[PDB]
Design a protein around this ligand. Structure first.
Ligand code: MG
Ligand code: MG
Ligand code: MG
Ligand code: MG
Ligand code: MG
Ligand code: MG
Ligand code: MG
Ligand code: MG
Ligand code: MG
Ligand code: MG
Ligand code: MG
Ligand code: MG
Ligand code: MG
Ligand code: MG
Ligand code: MG
Ligand code: MG
Ligand code: MG
Ligand code: MG
Ligand code: MG
Ligand code: MG
Ligand code: MG
Ligand code: MG
Ligand code: MG
Ligand code: ZN
Lengths: 155, 86, 123, 60
RNA sequence: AGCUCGAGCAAAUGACUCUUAAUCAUUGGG
RNA sequence: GGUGUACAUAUCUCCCUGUCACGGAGGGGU
RNA sequence: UUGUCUAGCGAGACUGCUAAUGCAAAUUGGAGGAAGGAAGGGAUGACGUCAAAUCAUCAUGCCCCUUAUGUCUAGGGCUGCAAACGUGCUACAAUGGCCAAUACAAACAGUCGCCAGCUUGUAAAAGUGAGCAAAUCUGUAAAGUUGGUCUCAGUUCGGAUUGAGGGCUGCAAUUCGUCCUCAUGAAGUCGGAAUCACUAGUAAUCGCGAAUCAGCUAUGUCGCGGUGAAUACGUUCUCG
RNA sequence: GGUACACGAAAAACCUUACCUAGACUUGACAUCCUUGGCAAAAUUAUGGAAACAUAAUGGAGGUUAACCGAGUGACAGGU
RNA sequence: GGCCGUAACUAUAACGGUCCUAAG
C-alpha cells in the first residue's frame, strides 16, 4: 500500500583503509551524533588489533564480518495461534547490515574495560568463529533449519 | 534569605502597639493580622492573636521564638484524616 | 586509618578520603588540604605521620563530624519545641519546604501504600 | 465583576507592584501583549481588520 | 428508625446529564 | 482469610477496549 | 585576506530538448543544468458530522439578585494529601565524572533596559562606571580538540531530601519566590503486561534568543543555529 | 476517548481573583438622561486605624465651564 | 451428596463459585 521503493544514499568509502564497511560500522556505533568519538573508537580498536594479532586490521575485520554474516532470515507470520516462521534468502546489503548491527550490539555488552578494548576483543573473537554474534548467527540458522518445512509458503 | 542591609521587618504599627503594651503593666492579647512581621526582642513576654485566616490564634512569644515570622507559629489549613474512596 | 573513629580507605586519594568523613565534604576537604599545604594526588597509604597529625589538627579546628549529628538533632528538637509550622511539618514526615505533596514527594513518605480509588460506574 | 476591575486597573494603586496590565479594548487580564496593549483575541481581530499597520500574516 | 437485622434497603437533598435511570456523596429519621 | 477446602474464588492497582465483560502483569489478606 | 554580506528589482526550471510507448493526457530513462518532473518548507482547510468546545475574551435572547449574587479593603486560599493517571526534566555512568587550556554559529532583544572594563567577595552579586536608541555598544556559546586524573564501586555516578550562612526583586519571601556557598547524601545498576514519535539536515543530541514578567525549580511555549544517523524487502497481518 | 490532562493560564506571595473569614458602602467603584451651580478632583502631611474609611491641613492642572467637580433626581448602573 | 453468593417493594433463586464420590 505504498507501491514505491525507497531510494538509497551513498555509503561513502572510508578515507583511511578505503573500505566502505569501516564507515558503515562507524555509523552503527554512532551515538548522540558524535562522528569524532565513533571514529576514535574504531581507530583505537584497529590499533589494538595491530598490537595483538600482528596482522592487517582490515583483513581481520573482513574475516570477522564474513564469518558473522548470516545466510537465512526467519520472518514472523501469525495466522491463528503463535507465529510460524519462514526462511528467506536475504540480500547482500541487508546481510552486511545485520552482521554489523549484531557485532556492535554484542560488543557493547561484554564485561571488559573501555569500549575501545570491548569492540576490539569482540572483533578478534569473531575472527575465529567463537563469539556472541557467532552464537546469534548459529541460533537463527538452527531455527531456520528446524523450520525448513514452511519455507515454501511465505505470503 | 532576606538581605542584610535591609535587616528585619515589622509593620511598625505592631511595633508601636508592642512598645505601648510593654510600657503598660496590665498587658492583654494583641490582635494582629500582620503575619509578615518578625518577632523583635521587645516582643518577648507579650501574647498575640494572629489571624490564621478564619480566627485569631493566641501565641505566647518567648525569649526563644525571637527571629522567626509572627504568623509562622499559627497554621492556615487543617488536614487530619482521609476517607476510603471505595 | 588514623582520623578519629573513621577508617578512610587506604587505596583512595587523600582529598576523597577526607570526604569520607561525615563532617567533611569535597570542597571543605580541598580547603583543609590547601591550608595544610599537603599535596593532593597522594594516596593515603603512602602518607606519613607528619601530615596525619596536621590534618587531624585542622579537622579538630573545624566542626567535629561527631558533634554535627547531635547539632542537627538539637536544632530539629528546638524547632519542634517552639510549635512552629515548619516544626510541625517536619514532625508529620512531610516535605518541610514549599514542595508540592499532591502527586509527588515520596522521598520523605517512603514506599507507596496503594489504596482503592473511587469506583466509576459512569454518570 | 469586570467593570469595577477595569476601573480599578485604570486607577493608580498605593503600591508599585500592585499594578497589572489589562487589555484596553476588552478587559481580559491574562495574555496581554505589552507591545500593543491588546490581548490575543482582540489582536487577532484587529490584525484581520487591518487596524494594526504592518502586521501581516507570516509565512517564514 | 418506614422495612430486613449502628449496618443494609426505603425517603430526601445536592453532584451527574438535554432530562431521567443508574451512580456518587451527604443526610434527617429510635 | 470475605466464601468453599497453603489452594481456588473473591478484593485492590496497572494494561486491553469507545465502555464493560473476558483476557494479561503485580500486590495483599488466616 | 576585497568581493563576502545585507535588501530592492530581475534572470533561471518550462516535461523546455531527446529515446521508448500511447489516440491523448501522460509514465520512465538520458543530456545540459545550482536545481527535474508538486526542487524542500510555510500560509492556504469545500458541503457537513460530533445539539463537539467556549455565556469565564467579546456581544447577546430569556430567567434570576437589586442596602446584595452589586462595591472597597486586610488576612487566608487557588501551592492541601493515604492514593491513581498524563506530559516533561534528571539519572542509573568510562561513547563517562571532575579540572585546565581552547576553536567554530544563526536568529533575536535592548534606555525603569542591554550592561563592556575595573575594585571587592569562596559565589550568587555589590560599588564605580564608560558604550549603545543600535549591521557600530551589550547579551561569556555548548557539544567538539588536546592534556591531567579517576579504573567499573551504589563509586570522584546520581542528585533528591534535610540543617546553616548569605544575594536580588519587592510595602512584604511563614503559609508561598528563586539564586549562591557550606554540610547530609533517598531511590535508581536499563525498568513487567503493554505502548509513542520519526523517511535528511529528519530522528538523536548541544547550546542561544524572545513573548507574558518587579521577581519566579517554565525542566513549559514560540523560534535559531552546531554535530548529525539507521531503515523502507513488501501489503500476509494491524488502526484509520 | 481519538478531538481533555506543561489545556484556557504568553507568569496565582499582595494585585491578578472570579473563592472563604472579617471590617466597611448604597442611583453606588463606572455611565447616560433630565432642573441646577461651579471659586475641583488628585497627590501628600497629621490622629484614629489590619487596611478599607473617617475627622484637619497645602486647597490647588485649568478655564468660568470646556473635559471634569459637583447638589437634586427617578428611570437605573452593576453581576466572571 | 453438601456448602456459599445472587433478580429494581418484599420473598425465592433462573444463574455463578467450590469440596468429595464410581456416579449424586
Ligand atoms: Mg514550589
Ligand atoms: Mg508510580
Ligand atoms: Mg462584562
Ligand atoms: Mg504582576
Ligand atoms: Mg447542566
Ligand atoms: Mg492550494
Ligand atoms: Mg453539549
Ligand atoms: Mg474538545
Ligand atoms: Mg451574563
Ligand atoms: Mg485580598
Ligand atoms: Mg492551578
Ligand atoms: Mg576523560
Ligand atoms: Mg566594529
Ligand atoms: Mg566578562
Ligand atoms: Mg577530551
Ligand atoms: Mg541501590
Ligand atoms: Mg556527581
Ligand atoms: Mg520562603
Ligand atoms: Mg554500577
Ligand atoms: Mg512523509
Ligand atoms: Mg489573591
Ligand atoms: Mg479654582
Ligand atoms: Mg458658571
Ligand atoms: Zn482584548
Amino acid at each position: 500500500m505504498r507501491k514505491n521503493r525507497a531510494p538509497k544514499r551513498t555509503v561513502l568509502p572510508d578515507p583511511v583503509f578505503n573500505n566502505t564497511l569501516v564507515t558503515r560500522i562507524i555509523n552503527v556505533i554512532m551515538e548522540d551524533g558524535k562522528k569524532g568519538l565513533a571514529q576514535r573508537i574504531l581507530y583505537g580498536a584497529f590499533d589494538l588489533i595491530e598490537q595483538r594479532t600482528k596482522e592487517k586490521p582490515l583483513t581481520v575485520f573482513e574475516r570477522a564480518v564474513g564469518n558473522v554474516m548470516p545466510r537465512l532470515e526467519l520472518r514472523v507470520r501469525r495466522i491463528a495461534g503463535s507465529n510460524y516462521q519462514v526462511p528467506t534468502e536475504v540480500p547482500q546489503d541487508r546481510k552486511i547490515a545485520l552482521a554489523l548491527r549484531w557485532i556492535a550490539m554484542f560488543a557493547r555488552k561484554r564485561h571488559e574495560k573501555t569500549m575501545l578494548e570491548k569492540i576490539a576483543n569482540e572483533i578478534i573473537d569473531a575472527s575465529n568463529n567463537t563469539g556472541a554474534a557467532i552464537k546469534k548467527k548459529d541460533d537463527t540458522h538452527k531455527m531456520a533449519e528446524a523450520n525448513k518445512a514452511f519455507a515454501h509458503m511465505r505470503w | 534569605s532576606r538581605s542584610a542591609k535591609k535587616g528585619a521587618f515589622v509593620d511598625a504599627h505592631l511595633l508601636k502597639k508592642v512598645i505601648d503594651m510593654n510600657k503598660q503593666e496590665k498587658k492583654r492579647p494583641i490582635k494582629t493580622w500582620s503575619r509578615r512581621s518578625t518577632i523583635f526582642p521587645e516582643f518577648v513576654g507579650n501574647t498575640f492573636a494572629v489571624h490564621n485566616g478564619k480566627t485569631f490564634i493566641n501565641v505566647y512569644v518567648t525569649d526563644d521564638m525571637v527571629g522567626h515570622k509572627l504568623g509562622e507559629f499559627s497554621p492556615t489549613r487543617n488536614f487530619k484524616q482521609h476517607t476510603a474512596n471505595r | 586509618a588514623r582520623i578519629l573513629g573513621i577508617d578512610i580507605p587506604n587505596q583512595k586519594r587523600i582529598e576523597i578520603a577526607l570526604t569520607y568523613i561525615f563532617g567533611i565534604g569535597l570542597s571543605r576537604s580541598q580547603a583543609i588540604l590547601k591550608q595544610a599545604n599537603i599535596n593532593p594526588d597522594k594516596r593515603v597509604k603512602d602518607l606519613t605521620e607528619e601530615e596525619f597529625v596536621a590534618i587531624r589538627n585542622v579537622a579538630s579546628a573545624y566542626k567535629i563530624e561527631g558533634d554535627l549529628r547531635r547539632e542537627i538533632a538539637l536544632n530539629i528538637k528546638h524547632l519542634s519545641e517552639i510549635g512552629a509550622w515548619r516544626g510541625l511539618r517536619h514532625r508529620k514526615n512531610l516535605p518541610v519546604r514549599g514542595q508540592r505533596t499532591r502527586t509527588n514527594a515520596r522521598t520523605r513518605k517512603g514506599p507507596r501504600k496503594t489504596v482503592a480509588n473511587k469506583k466509576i460506574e459512569s454518570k | 465583576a469586570k467593570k469595577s476591575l477595569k476601573v480599578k486597573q485604570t486607577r493608580i494603586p498605593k503600591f508599585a507592584v500592585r499594578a497589572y496590565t489589562r487589555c484596553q479594548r476588552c478587559g481580559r487580564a491574562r495574555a496581554v501583549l505589552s507591545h500593543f496593549g491588546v490581548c490575543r483575541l482582540c489582536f487577532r481581530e484587529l490584525a484581520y481588520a487591518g487596524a494594526i499597520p504592518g502586521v501581516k500574516k507570516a509565512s517564514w
